[PDB]
Amino acid sequence: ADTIVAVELDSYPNTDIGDPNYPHIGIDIKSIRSKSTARWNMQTGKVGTVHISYNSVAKRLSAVVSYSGSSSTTVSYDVDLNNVLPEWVRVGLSATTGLYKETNTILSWSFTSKLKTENSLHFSFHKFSQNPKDLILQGDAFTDSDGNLELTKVSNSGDPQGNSVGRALFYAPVHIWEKSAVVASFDATFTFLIKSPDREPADGITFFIANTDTSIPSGSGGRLLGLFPDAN
Amino acid sequence: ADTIVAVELDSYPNTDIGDPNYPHIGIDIKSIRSKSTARWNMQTGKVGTVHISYNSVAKRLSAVVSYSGSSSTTVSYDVDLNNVLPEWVRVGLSATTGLYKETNTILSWSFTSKLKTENSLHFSFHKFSQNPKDLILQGDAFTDSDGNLELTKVSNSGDPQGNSVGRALFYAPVHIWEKSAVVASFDATFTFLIKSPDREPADGITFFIANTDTSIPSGSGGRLLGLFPDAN
Amino acid sequence: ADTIVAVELDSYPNTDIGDPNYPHIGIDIKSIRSKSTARWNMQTGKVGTVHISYNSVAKRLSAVVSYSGSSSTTVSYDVDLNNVLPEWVRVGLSATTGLYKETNTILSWSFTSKLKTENSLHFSFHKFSQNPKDLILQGDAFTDSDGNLELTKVSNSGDPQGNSVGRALFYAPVHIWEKSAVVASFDATFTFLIKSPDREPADGITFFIANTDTSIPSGSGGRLLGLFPDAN
Amino acid sequence: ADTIVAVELDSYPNTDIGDPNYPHIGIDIKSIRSKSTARWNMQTGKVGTVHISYNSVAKRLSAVVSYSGSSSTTVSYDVDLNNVLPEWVRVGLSATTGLYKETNTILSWSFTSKLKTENSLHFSFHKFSQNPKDLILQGDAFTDSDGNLELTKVSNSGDPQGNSVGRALFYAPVHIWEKSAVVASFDATFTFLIKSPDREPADGITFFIANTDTSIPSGSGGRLLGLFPDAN
């Protein structure tokens, strides 16, 4: 099984598997059951922005989501990710739909990792090309004619389809920590557009870090966000 | 009086003004009396590296100092710096000597600030030019013929002089936070060479953030590190 | 008199002082009389993007302007800028109106300089704050309530006023070259909105590099773009 | 056959296949026979630094090599690399030895590509880990216990072996240009240590850009630098 650290943008409350009452942002450490959540006041139909950051000295993984001119929602969790992830990881974005749906559109994605022992990896996408060679697209993930990364199935009219899962992994493995490292840090930004007809959009988007060979776990559909094989 | 947030590399223990027993790294918030310290196992005569970071979401100011192949020393302090500093600051490095001395040599200095509401300021020096126009040199601060930033007086033979104070401020004011900011962050690295004849080198080096018009406070000598007018 | 290297976005053709027949982008080296121009097919009312780059090895200063989904316009000029500018410069944006006008709105501005002998300065603005401490605003330059940098006078209704001049200089001087430098390079991006009622918008926008103490030359109005005291 | 754009650091003059009389830096466009060369005054046993840059507006690929406090050697070649390379490439470093040898030690390697239509890829290595997951090591390429990238075979005593070829490719494919691109640019730095017993060190090091599936061509040994299958 994969090792997952994720920041989830969870549009759909699954209280029966640990979710709070409402859409929330969450820090997921090896379980869909968030270690820390904050209430996410969704603005379906508007472009959202997520900023994620961590450094191995502060050991605080923090995420903030906002829309233009809105209140931001922040969530934090003290965690030494060295105890969780392998030295070499891949970073990615995942999304699902289930019984309920939403577009899981990524409009931009950037990521900077740094490893002082100064090693560094930065990538940033504003356009996604029709054939992203530097992306590993998994499942229903695809780039559309607007150069948007669509993590989950969307029809031609642009209606999201349910029971879809998809992710994009940056092609290059990231060295997020190392024995002699004095400090490893990473930051990530993605902007997203969740549109839905359902009065309860589902299921969400995550930025995630995993073992380099990470694949979509069987049964990771819907509330599991394409990240976990079960709700444990 | 100036508003100071600093990370101090305090070679000299002044227990009578709050210092612990030993050389320490410290997070200073508006007082030379550190909110958080860690024991700093000095390696006088060796090049040291300090990494400082903070973002307004995690609200954890963290610093780590190390020498090649040594144990690092980290120190952290949870603090919303918005409650401390004005929106616009200058960043700088300060050093002092007093009764006891040490060279306060800066070999490199870099700083990245970011302000999402994405505004950004990055500077990095590996060489310091004989006339640093982008630096505001205060007190005894000067760049030498090796292109090294010497914060405190050093003779021609290169012996440090006591009772010296000096700082370098990056010329451009940094906008470290702002009303609409969703997340402001900064990182700073400097490398330093502290050499001393004294069996107790003094007094230390800091990276600091202050009101843009920050100047060396009268009586900020020695244990006060060129940052504070008193030990309160 | 100031030393000017500029890339001009010249909305208004002044053939009587060297301009070609039409709006053009130009590389200006110590004269409003461009060393190289390209025809600039203006799209008044649309957001434009200028990319400027140079490195001291290739010695090719190049600029490209485009609007979304349009043909770009590029202009180049082989020049060792070491022979032109002093070691320490300030970078800025200038605009003018004269008999004819246009808004000279800067929506973003970034600049990266690098100096290997690796010294570096990066700044990028997407918002401009009401009081830009890191900007030196000259003349009619001001930031508006949209966080836009307006180089020239615009009324409350947002109509541009004629006979206006204004510039913004990044506060920190840039070390663009140095005796021991192996390679100095800089890149600059700004995005701009030129709106005009006049069927001939005037007078233009430039990104420019100048002696650090650069000020708006008397008589630099209109076709002189706030950069030169005469048309020589 | 692969499509190669390379900057060669050619320690060994092979005049019978187009080389000038002496060690040279060269811009190679789809042939080991450089389009442009400059005399490279080698400093075997000293750490060298190569800076490579290009942008699609200036269309000038330029490289400079230097050692601390030495005269630099620059070479340029006007070329639209869009006419040469496919949209998606991999960047790498190659080295060979043949009858004569040298260590082909890479101490650092960084690369920034940018694609405005702002997409971007930056990586920088100062240490190379024992298992570089983000590097595709080809042939004799390996990282040693000093965290140095050794492109060609070096014995335990650290003596280079002849008839060796090796390269490291950054794992992630780079999108170096694209139909809608307004400007694509890349910069690359690597530092290298060439040590040799031979009074004629061979054969050299290159930074290269190639089709993503680039492999070491059969017969690319020695003077062909692991880049070309023949000397045509």
Ligand SMILES: OC[C@H]1O[C@H](Oc2c[nH]c3ccc(Br)c(Cl)c23)[C@@H](O)[C@@H](O)[C@@H]1O
């Ligand atoms: O898209 C939202 C959800 O729909 C599915 O579960 C449902 C949530 N509301 C329901 C009501 C009835 C039935 Br049957 C089901 Cl499966 C569900 C599942 O796919 C969930 O994993 C998912 O989170």
Ligand SMILES: OC[C@H]1O[C@H](Oc2c[nH]c3ccc(Br)c(Cl)c23)[C@@H](O)[C@@H](O)[C@@H]1O
């Ligand atoms: O350089 C170290 C220190 O020397 C001075 O205080 C002294 C520390 N040891 C002493 C012993 C005697 C006397 Br008098 C003095 Cl001032 C000191 C002062 O300058 C201090 O601020 C400083 O920290």
Ligand SMILES: OC[C@H]1O[C@H](Oc2c[nH]c3ccc(Br)c(Cl)c23)[C@@H](O)[C@@H](O)[C@@H]1O
């Ligand atoms: O804004 C465009 C121009 O207007 C002025 O010159 C005029 C261009 N068309 C004209 C026609 C008549 C007279 Br009088 C004048 Cl000054 C001009 C001047 O301010 C110029 O510098 C400028 O380029």
Ligand SMILES: OC[C@H]1O[C@H](Oc2c[nH]c3ccc(Br)c(Cl)c23)[C@@H](O)[C@@H](O)[C@@H]1O
């Ligand atoms: O390392 C340097 C060179 O050695 C080989 O060619 C030789 C250059 N000097 C020679 C002298 C005699 C013979 Br046989 C050979 Cl193959 C060579 C070949 O491996 C070349 O490709 C290479 O550039």
Ligand SMILES: [Ca+2]
């Ligand atoms: Ca859920």
Ligand SMILES: [Ca+2]
């Ligand atoms: Ca002290």
Ligand SMILES: [Ca+2]
């Ligand atoms: Ca004109």
Ligand SMILES: [Ca+2]
């Ligand atoms: Ca050769």
Ligand SMILES: [Cl-]
């Ligand atoms: Cl339901």
Ligand SMILES: [Cl-]
């Ligand atoms: Cl004492």
Ligand SMILES: [Cl-]
């Ligand atoms: Cl007229």
Ligand SMILES: [Cl-]
């Ligand atoms: Cl021979």
Ligand SMILES: [Mn+2]
């Ligand atoms: Mn959840």
Ligand SMILES: [Mn+2]
């Ligand atoms: Mn102290």
Ligand SMILES: [Mn+2]
């Ligand atoms: Mn003109």
Ligand SMILES: [Mn+2]
């Ligand atoms: Mn050659």
